[PDB]
């Protein structure tokens, strides 16, 4: 199929809430090798967010059950089911990380897109880290942190403090600190700095830019509140 | 694998909202050949309702898109056909379990009516997406399943029994939506509603917790429909 057929099928699948189909379509589009437009990037990102998100949600439910059951053949059942889900989750994440390495990051022609894909790399390694155990974990955590840190440096140099992607990177990187590295102090510092540097320039923004930026500023504000209360 | 173990996996899959896994577990349970407990019957029903429901929902969305549009209008049609095939496979799966295990093994009228209603239901889902020649034979199989359920429930169940009520409701919907015959639909729903209210006028207490809400569904269709 050509790109436009694949893109329209992805949009149909999105409407039909069939996200596995949606992701397969956009994976094929990505593999044609041309730099994605903002619309194609959005379709790809939304598709995989939903596909991996279903596994992350299921994983947390089954993990909780496994941990709250006076051992039995019950605990083993939950353990094995958890592992089945983890394998799906890892395959999904490896697929995304391969697209990032082979196509998305190399083809990114603008600082905005480059930061977006490095944040995305940080995110999907973070999802691997949520589920990693023992030997493999440290390595995975480092890969996440290095993607986020590189995204962070480029965004600081190239983007306005109120840019939604710069803000969104600060948000997810702070979540990484809080939750993966168990470093609350750095998580809160990161998030507060991004928030404060954005308010200091909020007068620059247009009516529409303002709405974009303030949505993510609210998320930084609310995470901070949650973590400092 | 142990039946009780499959059942506990079905419940795990349910909590994780993985309904395909849930259905696969209860299908294996059914295929072991023993009559299903009430719990097992509910888990099977709930699993396949969700599985087939996702496709029906997708099918309605993609059909609505296909209608509201020549190259895009045909892409939709071929996607819709992809969804139809999944849907047909799921329905045939269920209908085969009903035929091979559930209905012949049902030793109580309540279970037997439940499974025959389920047969009526899944042939109805097939009719929702059937085309041309095949549709009439599908529609007839749905109606015969409902009718058989209906005759048993009339003899063996109280008019306020939620399964008897749920049958009258779905059978009436079939007459209206599938057979486009609201004269038959209204008559059946009215008769069912009237018999249930005559019982409640007689007894002091409702025998089942959900009777009155299903009775409301019947009258609202009766009022909405003629």
């Amino acid at each position: 199929m050509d790109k436009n057929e694949l893109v329209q099928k992805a949009k149909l699948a999105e409407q039909a809430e069939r996200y596995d189909d949606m992701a397969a379509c956009m994976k094929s589009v990505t593999e044609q090798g041309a730099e994605l437009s903002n619309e194609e990037r959005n379709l790809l990102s939304v598709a995989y967010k939903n596909v991996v998100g279903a596994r992350r949600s299921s994983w947390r439910v089954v993990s909780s059950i496994e941990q709250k059951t006076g051992a039995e053949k019950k605990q083993q059942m939950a353990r094995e089911y958890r592992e089945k889900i983890e394998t799906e989750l890892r395959d999904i994440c490896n697929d995304v990380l391969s697209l990032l390495e082979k196509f998305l990051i190399p083809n990114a022609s603008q600082a905005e897109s480059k930061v977006f894909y490095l944040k995305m790399k940080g995110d999907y390694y973070r999802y691997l880290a949520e589920v990693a155990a023992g030997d493999d974990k440290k390595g995975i955590v480092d890969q996440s942190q290095q993607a986020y840190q590189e995204a962070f440096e480029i965004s600081k140099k190239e983007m306005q403090p109120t840019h939604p992607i710069r803000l969104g990177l600060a948000l997810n990187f702070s979540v990484f600190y809080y939750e993966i590295l168990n470093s609350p102090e750095k998580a809160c510092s990161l998030a507060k700095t991004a928030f404060d540097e954005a308010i200091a320039e909020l007068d620059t923004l247009s009516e529409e830019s303002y709405k974009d930026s303030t949505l993510i500023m609210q998320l930084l504000r609310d995470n901070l509140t949650l973590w400092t209360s | 694998m142990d039946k009780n173990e499959l059942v506990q996996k079905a419940k795990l899959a349910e909590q994780a909202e993985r309904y395909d896994d849930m259905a696969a577990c209860m299908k294996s349970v059914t295929e072991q050949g023993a009559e299903l407990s009430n719990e097992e019957r509910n888990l099977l029903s709930v699993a396949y309702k969700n599985v087939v429901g996702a496709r029906r929902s997708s099918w309605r969305v993609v059909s609505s898109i296909e209608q509201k549009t020549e190259k895009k209008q045909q892409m939709a049609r071929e996607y819709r056909e992809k969804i139809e095939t999944e849907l047909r496979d799921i329905c045939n799966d269920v209908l085969s379990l009903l035929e091979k295990f559930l209905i012949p093994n049902a030793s109580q009228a309540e279970s037997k009516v439940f499974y025959l209603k389920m047969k009526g239901d899944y042939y109805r889902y097939l009719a929702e997406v059937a085309a041309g020649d095949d549709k009439k034979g599908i529609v007839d199989q749905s109606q015969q399943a409902y009718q058989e359920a209906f005759e048993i429930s009339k003899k063996e169940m109280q008019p306020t029994h939620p399964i008897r009520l749920g049958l009258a409701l779905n059978f009436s919907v079939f007459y209206y939506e599938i057979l486009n015959s609201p004269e038959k639909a209204c008559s059946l729903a009215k008769t069912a509603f009237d018999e249930a209210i005559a019982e409640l006028d007689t007894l002091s207490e409702e025998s089942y917790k959900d009777s009155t809400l299903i009775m409301q569904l019947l009258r609202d269709n009766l009022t909405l429909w003629t």
Binding site: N38, R41, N42, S45, V46, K49, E112, F116, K119, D123, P164, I165, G168, L171, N172, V175, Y178, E179, I216, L219, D222, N223, L226, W227 | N38, R41, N42, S45, V46, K49, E110, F114, D121, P162, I163, G166, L169, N170, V173, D210, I214, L217, N221
Partner: peptide, 19 residues
């Protein structure tokens, strides 16, 4: 339009969708 079957504050992370 209705048929029946009978039975016997987390932290936020964000995806940017730039138009």
């Amino acid at each position: 339009r209705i048929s029946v079957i009978s039975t016997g504050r987390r932290r936020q992370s964000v995806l940017n969708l730039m138009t």
